Amino acid sequence: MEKQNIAVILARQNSKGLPLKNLRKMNGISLLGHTINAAISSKCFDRIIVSTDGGLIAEEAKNFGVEVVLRPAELASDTASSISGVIHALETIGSNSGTVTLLQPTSPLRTGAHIREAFSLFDEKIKGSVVSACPMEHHPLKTLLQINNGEYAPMRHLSDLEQPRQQLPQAFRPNGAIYINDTASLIANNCFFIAPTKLYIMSHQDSIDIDTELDLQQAENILNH
Amino acid sequence: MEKQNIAVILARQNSKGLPLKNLRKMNGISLLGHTINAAISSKCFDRIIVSTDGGLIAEEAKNFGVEVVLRPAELASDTASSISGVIHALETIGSNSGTVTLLQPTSPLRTGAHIREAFSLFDEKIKGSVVSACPMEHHPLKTLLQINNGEYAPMRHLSDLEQPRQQLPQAFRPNGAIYINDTASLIANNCFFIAPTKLYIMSHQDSIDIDTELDLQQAENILNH
Numbered sequence: 001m002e003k004q005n006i007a008v009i010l011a012r013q014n015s016k017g018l019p020l021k022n023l024r025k026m027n028g029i030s031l032l033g034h035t036i037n038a039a040i041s042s043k044c045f046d047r048i049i050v051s052t053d054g055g056l057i058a059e060e061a062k063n064f065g066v067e068v069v070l071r072p073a074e075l076a077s078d079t080a081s082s083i084s085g086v087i088h089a090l091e092t093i094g095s096n097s098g099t100v101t102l103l104q105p106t107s108p109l110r111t112g113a114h115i116r117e118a119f120s121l122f123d124e125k126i127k128g129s130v131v132s133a134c135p136m137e138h139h140p141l142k143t144l145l146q147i148n149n150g151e152y153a154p155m156r157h158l159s160d161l162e163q164p165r166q167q168l169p170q171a172f173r174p175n176g177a178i179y180i181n182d183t184a185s186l187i188a189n190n191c192f193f194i195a196p197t198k199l200y201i202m203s204h205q206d207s208i209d210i211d212t213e214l215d216l217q218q219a220e221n222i223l224n225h
Numbered sequence: 226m227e228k229q230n231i232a233v234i235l236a237r238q239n240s241k242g243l244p245l246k247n248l249r250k251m252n253g254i255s256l257l258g259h260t261i262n263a264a265i266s267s268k269c270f271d272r273i274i275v276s277t278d279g280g281l282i283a284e285e286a287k288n289f290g291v292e293v294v295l296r297p298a299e300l301a302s303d304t305a306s307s308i309s310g311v312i313h314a315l316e317t318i319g320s321n322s323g324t325v326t327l328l329q330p331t332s333p334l335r336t337g338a339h340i341r342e343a344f345s346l347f348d349e350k351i352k353g354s355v356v357s358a359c360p361m362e363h364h365p366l367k368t369l370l371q372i373n374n375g376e377y378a379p380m381r382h383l384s385d386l387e388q389p390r391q392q393l394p395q396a397f398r399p400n401g402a403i404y405i406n407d408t409a410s411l412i413a414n415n416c417f418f419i420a421p422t423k424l425y426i427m428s429h430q431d432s433i434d435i436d437t438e439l440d441l442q443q444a445e446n447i448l449n450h
């Protein structure tokens with residue numbers, strides 16, 4: 001089997017957060033649609049798969065000219081991991097060699113140009129992940145973690161809590177929009193973060209993710225201006 | 226000397242972000258006032274000191290029946306540390322034994338009740354700090370830190386990045402509202418975080434910090450609701 005570059009868009013119907021959000025529209029196009037358009041315009045992929053439990057999402061995906069994989073209910077439940085859905089997609093189409101890129105519909109401001117630039121960072125030989133990320137508002141060294149019995153432990157050093165921010169290393173958080181991996185690597189590791197992980201840095205604005213009604217309205221604002 | 230429980234309220238005049246904010250009113254009472262009220266109603270303190278270079282700030286403090294320390298210009302500049310201000314206040318009143326608690330005017334939704342509950346966590350034998358903190362919107366284990374420009378390492382494990390959040394230890398950040406220490410320990414270490422540090426957890430809402438006019442309006446609307 002030849003290598004294929006695969007895009008997998010996991011888009012189950014249920015969202016406790018914002019109801020049916022994968023088909024909620026922004027500027028007239030569903031969230032699913034905006035992500036499908038990003039995948040297509042990137043020209044990075046041989047095949048674009050929407051994996052869904054089915055129904056109106058499956059129909060929407062077919063209207064965009066992309067493939068549909070039907071996940072059983074267990075793999076589209078509230079607890080089902082994203083990795084298990086991507087592994088299932090790959091097994092269903094029978095691809096185990098090339099690249100696999102997770103594109104979440106919840107990042108509608110992530111464009112095809114973003115995908116292309118992230119792809120530029122992917123090393124075919126080295127095969128570490130490329131993951132989109134954004135800067136952190138609150139520095140994650142300036143935190144403590146709850147441990148047992150009402151105690152806490154610093155993230156790193158107690159001295160970090162008082163350290164001038166700019167003397168700490170720069171921190172980024174993965175933003176959910178893009179995860180690129182080598183396919184055989186992802187299958188073998190059963191995860192999206194494979195070392196050496198590269199980050200594709202996006203602004204806060206382009207990193208907005210849709211969990212609530214207010215995120216939807218805010219993202220739509222950002223589109224228009 | 227006999228031990229004393231000291232509250233120190235640093236309230237400099239020349240705030241740059243929100244002009245003159247320490248006397249800006251929120252529902253009829255100055256920021257200074259709200260924190261003084263909280264210190265008095267807590268009943269945790271033997272003495273309450275407002276340290277300031279501002280004449281109007283000193284008057285306001287006197288009007289609430291608490292002590293005023295005059296802060297020299299050098300300890301009231303834009304870059305003067307809080308620790309140097311507390312050390313000076315303690316030196317000025319001649320207290321070097323008991324506890325000392327920093328109560329920033331910029332946390333006006335922090336109440337006497339919050340202060341009293343935090344105080345209950347302090348251990349006179351062990352003498353670690355008690356610091357108020359709030360939950361993190363973004364989990365600090367789900368971050369990566371820049372190690373040499375182009376390279377990033379996970380905060381802790383690669384696997385943390387994709388772990389479902391509810392399976393990670395809960396995380397918190399200092400909110401600036403309350404820092405309780407042993408006085409001799411604070412003087413010897415010249416810092417606010419002394420091991421073993423414990424947190425007093427506050428809501429995001431009660432943790433609101435006043436850095437802007439909009440912040441002040443938000444706090445006021447919160448008290449109104």
Ligand SMILES: Nc1ccn([C@@H]2O[C@H](COP(=O)(O)OP(=O)(O)OP(=O)(O)O)[C@@H](O)[C@H]2O)c(=O)n1
Nearest residue numbers: 010011012014015016017080081082104105106
């Ligand atoms: N096993 C999974 C996990 C996530 N998703 C999808 O991937 C995106 C990211 O999901 P997220 O917003 O983190 O949480 P949800 O599971 O969407 O929403 P809810 O939690 O309210 O059900 C969404 O488009 C969601 O539908 C999916 O299809 N299948």
Ligand SMILES: Nc1ccn([C@@H]2O[C@H](COP(=O)(O)OP(=O)(O)OP(=O)(O)O)[C@@H](O)[C@H]2O)c(=O)n1
Nearest residue numbers: 235236237240241242243305306307329330331
């Ligand atoms: N050395 C210090 C540091 C801080 N503060 C006070 O502590 C609170 C928190 O500090 P910050 O929010 O930074 O306020 P300002 O320094 O007053 O404002 P700006 O930073 O906008 O100049 C404020 O009541 C501030 O006046 C102080 O009196 N002396």
Ligand SMILES: [Ca+2]
Nearest residue numbers: 208209210211
């Ligand atoms: Ca969000």
Ligand SMILES: [Ca+2]
Nearest residue numbers: 240241303304
């Ligand atoms: Ca300041």
Ligand SMILES: [Ca+2]
Nearest residue numbers: 331434435436
């Ligand atoms: Ca501030």
